[PDB]
Swiss-Prot record:
Residues 7-279 form the Peptidase S8 domain. This is Proteinase K. It comes from Parengyodontium album. Ca(2+) 2 binds at T16, D260. The chain holds residues 106 to 384 of 384 of the full protein. GO terms for cellular component: extracellular region. The active site is at D39, H69, S224.
Length: 279
């Protein structure tokens, strides 16, 4: 299928050149896959989720997203106008509050919860998780992302927005997950994007239009916004049966658009998430 005047990031992961405005994808659109969005929550009521989004855990008063961050990345994963896997099931795991500031112990707990909660669900095609959160280095946050990964979830985390080597950041520095970087609509590395050897793939992270709280939309920029693109890509490529939860990070990397990106510091992968869709 095709999506005309799609948000530039969607169009980018379906072509080998920037500037284009059409998002091409296979009709499956990630049906039968689930993506746990681990963030500030999901306004499941948003018409762009079409009843495919639901909150399954919070670590605060409400399951309601009073921030917008989680609703945005849930939207980029699988909302209908702004999502990569537009048919996927989304599961809100609220580890950040409505300020976007979740303790390491809470983020560890939400990751251990997903690793268990996935057994309660019906995700025949595979389980994905999108961690648009971040933070300084910690073995315990790293270990939790790895446990979540080895438990059969495809974990995509953000490299962080500190214009630094991502190895000083968790869960970004965990080797066994998919540390996603951010690029912009001109195939540059994003101005804030972290980098380093641990980075596995780059995504559209600058000026990402997606859903927002209050039934609205909003365009915002961060490696936090490039993470759902790959997460939705993984959910999409898993529903296609082209990859599994444990190999989806390196399939997207094998099948990436290499050399396309500018200002990729030496020793960092120059790979852009690309669904390689044809007909």
């Amino acid at each position: 299928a095709a999506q005309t005047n799609a948000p530039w990031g969607l169009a980018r992961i379906s072509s080998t050149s920037p500037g284009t405005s059409t998002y091409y994808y296979d009709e499956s659109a990630g049906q039968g896959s689930c993506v746990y969005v681990i963030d500030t929550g999901i306004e499941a009521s948003h018409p762009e989720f079409e009843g495919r989004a639901q909150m399954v855990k919070t670590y605060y008063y409400s399951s309601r997203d009073g921030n917008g961050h989680g609703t945005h990345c849930a939207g980029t994963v699988g909302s209908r106008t702004y999502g990569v896997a537009k048919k996927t099931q989304l599961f809100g795991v609220k580890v950040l509050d409505d300020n976007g500031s979740g303790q390491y112990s809470t983020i560890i707990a939400g990751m251990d919860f997903v690793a268990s909660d996935k057994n309660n669900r019906n995700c025949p095609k595979g389980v994905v998780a999108s961690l648009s959160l971040g933070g300084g280095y910690s073995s315990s946050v790293n270990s939790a992302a790895a446990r979540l990964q080895s438990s059969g979830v495809m974990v995509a985390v953000a490299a962080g927005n500190n214009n630094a080597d991502a190895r000083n950041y968790s869960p970004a520095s965990e080797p066994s997950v998919c540390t996603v970087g951010a690029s912009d609509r001109y195939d540059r590395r994003s101005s804030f994007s972290n980098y380093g050897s641990v980075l596995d793939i780059f995504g559209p992270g600058t000026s990402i239009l997606s859903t927002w709280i209050g039934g609205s939309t909003r365009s915002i920029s961060g490696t936090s916004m490039a993470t759902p693109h790959v997460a939705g890509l993984a959910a999409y490529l898993m529903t296609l049966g082209k990859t599994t939860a444990a190999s989806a990070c390196r399939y997207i990397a094998d099948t990436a658009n290499k050399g396309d990106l500018s200002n990729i510091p030496f020793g960092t992968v120059n790979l852009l998430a690309y669904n390689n869709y044809q007909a």
